[PDB]
From Swiss-Prot:
Residue ranges of the annotated DNA-binding region, renumbered to this chain: 1-40
Parent-protein start and end of this portion: 1 to 42 of 265
Free-text function comment from the UniProt entry: Trans-acting regulatory protein that activates transcription of the MT genes (metallothionein) in response to copper or silver ions.
Organism: Candida glabrata (strain ATCC 2001 / BCRC 20586 / JCM 3761 / NBRC 0622 / NRRL Y-65 / CBS 138)
Protein name: Metal-activated transcriptional activator protein AMT1
Name of the encoding gene: AMT1
Superkingdom of the source species: Eukaryota
Compartments reported by the entry: Nucleus
Positions bound to Zn(2+): 11, 14, 23, 25
Length: 42
């Protein structure tokens, strides 16, 4: 996975899987993520 400033990211084959724990792939579409969030309502 990758992180910038205070943002997180990883391949769709990790962030969606779990390997993101230490993703280091190249190909494949990347994505972003953060330390939990949750909706404002539901
Ligand atoms: Zn990956």
């Amino acid at each position: 996975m990758v992180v910038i400033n205070g943002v997180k990211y990883a391949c769709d084959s990790c962030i969606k899987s779990h390997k993101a724990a230490q993703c280091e792939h190249n190909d494949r579409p990347l994505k972003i993520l953060k330390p939990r969030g949750r909706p404002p309502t539901t």
